[PDB]
């Protein structure tokens, strides 16, 4: 907007003071809203990280499960082998 040529400088100053205090309020409430989003993003980021420290534990359980599967397979493959060696 270009300032209207008929306006008094007193009116223009009081108009601009009112708007700068409106803008001052909304700056602090918008910045406070951004600050709440910082914490919510940081706590969700900490939540994801603490779950990733537990994905490392699921990978450990798969290695334990794979070891049980390997052992039962060859306990069975030794039992057939010893049965054939008794049967004969």
């Amino acid at each position: 907007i270009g300032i209207n040529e008929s306006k008094l400088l007193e009116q223009l100053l009081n108009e601009w003071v009112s708007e700068i205090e409106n803008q001052t309020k909304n700056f602090y409430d918008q910045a406070k809203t951004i600050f709440v989003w910082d914490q919510r993003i940081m706590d969700n980021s900490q939540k994801l990280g603490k779950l990733m420290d537990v994905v490392v534990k699921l990978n450990s359980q798969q290695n334990a499960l794979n070891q049980c599967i390997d052992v039962v397979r060859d306990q069975q493959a030794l039992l057939e082998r010893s049965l054939n060696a008794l049967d004969s």
Binding site: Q30, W37, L65, C68, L79
Partner: protein
């Protein structure tokens, strides 16, 4: 100032996603030991014969 988006929907959606991932993760630990104890029983069942 008039161009300020809200984002609390996206920050709810990510929170809920991180509770779904936690719920699946604890099911995954139960499903792991249900198998691991089942295979341990198959070993003790062979160990005697």
């Amino acid at each position: 100032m008039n161009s300020f988006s809200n984002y609390d929907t996206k920050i709810n959606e990510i929170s809920i996603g991180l509770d779904q991932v936690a719920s699946v993760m604890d099911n995954l630990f139960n499903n792991f030991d249900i198998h691991i104890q089942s295979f341990k029983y198959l070993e003790e069942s062979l160990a005697k014969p």
